[PDB]
């Protein structure tokens, strides 16, 4: 028997305060049934990790949102990487892994670090800043669009385009329906910027299209792989950076430990991703009957994974509700796990590291000062506004 719960993990009240409900989702049993959306879920670390690491049984090609692509019309042409299974997934995964490789990070890191330091020096001249608009948003906007090779015009569609894609994985509630009603101009902008003549030489977009020249991908595939990096590669990092600043603001003792040893910057950022889990949820679909958490689940069934919950599961983590910058974070599922584990995770950790390193070296205190406003999204957790006072070192 699978326990039934009435929790709506896509409701505003849940977004505004998820922790008691995530606890209940964990503690009711290892597999739950959600009355509201008629779907199975798993919220503990063990099950979430086991599902992520069995892609044959728990496939992605039937979509990683609620909608079942075998049954329902995808709201947009499916991603070649996120919404595919091996073997079809492998060649596009290989292309983006090479585009976003450690050797590539080396070539862009000095520029990203200089931007992060200049950003923090500029914020400290104002003192009173919005850690979202002026920092979690402004910093990735200053490095990632340039790193892709994108033109200047139309960049203001990037954040709302990614908000839409993330809302569209969710159930058919008002967040999802309003995003889709308003999607056309964001998609028209992104479609144009995926085309080879619009991507500057040297940048990720141009590097992707160079795979057509060796026959590694077709001219039709290349724009869809650019589209992947424009769907996933900005808002995620905005929310991960926003999480880490919010964590440093709420846990003054951790900011002081970071200031004592700035080489903690990389792990301080990793722990922010665990702690807040910017991407909260993803689904899979069963490919056969499977025993999961002691329950037998039939073939063809959607399963919701609570990544944010797995990252706070006390069966896996000591004091999961504390932000601890020296925590051993290895194994958290905030970037996923297994064959689809975040292919952009080195870009995200580069931005995260260099930014917290700048904060480590330059800032003595971060005090929230003003109303904190949350942004609601079906898949993304993060704030809309986070007014803070920064005190220089």
59 touches ligand TWO (CB under 6 A): no
Q: Tokens for 97?
A: 């892994």
For residue 187, the partner it binds in Cl ion, ligand HEM, ligand TWO, none, with Cβ less than 5 to 8 A by kind, is Cl ion
- CA dihedral of residues 268, 270, 276, 282 (deg, nearest 10): 180
81 touches ligand TWO (CB under 6 A): yes
Kindly state the helix (H) or strand (E) to which residue 292 belongs, with its residue range: strand 290-292
Q: Tokens for 88?
A: 């079809």
Between residue 158 and residue 197, which ones bind ligand TWO under the rule CB under 6 A?
A: 162, 165-166
Write down the least CB distance from residue 53 to ligand TWO, Å: 17
Comparing CB distances to ligand HEM, the nearer of 347 and 366 is: 347
For residue 233, the partner it binds in ligand HEM, ligand TWO, Cl ion, none, with Cβ less than 5 to 8 A by kind, is ligand HEM
Q: How far apart are CA 202 and CA 52, in angstroms?
A: 34
For ligand TWO, the nearest residue by Cβ is: 79
> What secondary structure does DSSP assign to 87-108, as a single string?
TTTHHHHHHHHHHT-HHHHHHH
Comparing CB distances to ligand TWO, the nearer of 165 and 222 is: 165
79 touches ligand TWO (CB under 6 A): yes
Query: Would you tell me which residues interact with ligand HEM (CB under 6 A)?
Result: 60, 64, 81-82, 93, 96, 100, 228-229, 232-233, 236-237, 240, 273, 278-279, 282, 334-336, 340, 342-344, 347-348
Task: Report the candidate in 251, 252, 270 with the shortest Cα–Cα distance to residue 326.
Answer: 270
89 carries a ligand binding annotation? yes
Inter-axis angle of helices 90-99 and 221-232, nearest 10: 60
284 carries a ligand binding annotation? yes
Q: How far apart are CA 212 and CA 207, in angstroms?
A: 10
Contact call for residues 123 and 199 (beta carbons, < 8 A): no
For residue 162, the partner it binds in Cl ion, ligand HEM, ligand TWO, none, with Cβ less than 5 to 8 A by kind, is ligand TWO
Q: How far apart are CA 7 and CA 27, in angstroms?
A: 13
**Site of tokens 């424009």:** 230
309 touches ligand TWO (CB under 6 A): no
Write down the least CB distance from residue 160 to ligand HEM, Å: 17
Kindly state the helix (H) or strand (E) to which residue 34 belongs, with its residue range: strand 32-34
378 touches ligand TWO (CB under 6 A): no
Q: Mark the binding-site residues for heme b, compressed into ranges.
A: 89, 93, 284, 340, 342
Residues at the interface with ligand TWO (CB under 6 A): 79, 81-82, 162, 165-166, 228, 231-232, 279
């Amino acid at each position: 028997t699978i326990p039934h719960l009435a929790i709506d993990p896509f409701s505003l009240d849940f977004f505004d305060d998820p922790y008691p409900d995530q606890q209940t989702l964990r503690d009711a049993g290892p597999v739950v049934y959600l009355d509201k959306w008629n779907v199975y879920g798993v919220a503990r670390y063990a099950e979430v990790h086991a599902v992520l690491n069995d892609p044959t049984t728990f496939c992605s090609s039937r979509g990683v949102g609620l909608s079942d692509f075998k049954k329902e019309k995808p709201w947009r042409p499916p991603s070649l990487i996120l919404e595919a299974d091996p073997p079809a997934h492998t060649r596009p995964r290989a292309v983006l892994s090479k585009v976003l490789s450690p050797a590539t990070m080396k070539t862009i890191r000095d520029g990203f670090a200089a931007a992060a330091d200049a950003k923090v020096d500029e914020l400290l001249q104002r003192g009173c800043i919005d850690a979202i608009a002026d920092l979690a948003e402004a910093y990735p906007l200053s490095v990632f669009p340039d790193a892709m090779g994108l033109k200047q015009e139309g960049r203001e569609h990037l954040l709302p385009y990614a908000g839409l894609v993330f809302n569209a994985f969710g159930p058919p509630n008002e967040l999802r329906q309003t995003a889709i009603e308003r999607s056309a101009p964001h998609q028209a902008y992104v479609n144009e910027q995926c085309q080879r003549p619009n991507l500057a030489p040297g940048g990720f977009g141009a590097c992707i299209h160079a795979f057509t020249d060796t026959g590694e991908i077709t001219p039709d595939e290349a724009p869809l792989l650019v589209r992947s990096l424009l769907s996933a590669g900005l808002d995620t990092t905005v929310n991960g950076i926003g999480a880490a600043v919010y964590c440093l603001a709420r846990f003054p003792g951790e900011l002081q430990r970071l200031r004592s040893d700035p080489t903690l910057a990389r792990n301080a950022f990793e722990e922010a991703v665990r702690f807040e889990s910017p991407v909260q949820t993803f689904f899979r679909t069963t490919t056969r009957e499977v025993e999961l958490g002691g329950a037998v689940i039939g073939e063809g069934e959607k399963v919701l994974m609570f990544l944010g919950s797995a990252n706070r599961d006390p069966r896996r983590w000591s004091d999961p509700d504390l932000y601890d910058i020296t925590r051993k974070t290895s194994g958290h599922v905030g970037f996923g796990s297994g064959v689809h584990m975040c292919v952009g995770q080195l870009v995200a950790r580069l931005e995260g590291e260099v930014m917290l390193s700048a904060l480590a070296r330059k800032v003595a205190a971060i005090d929230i000062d003003g109303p904190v406003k949350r942004r609601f999204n079906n898949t993304l957790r993060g704030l809309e506004s986070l007014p803070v006072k920064l005190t220089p070192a």
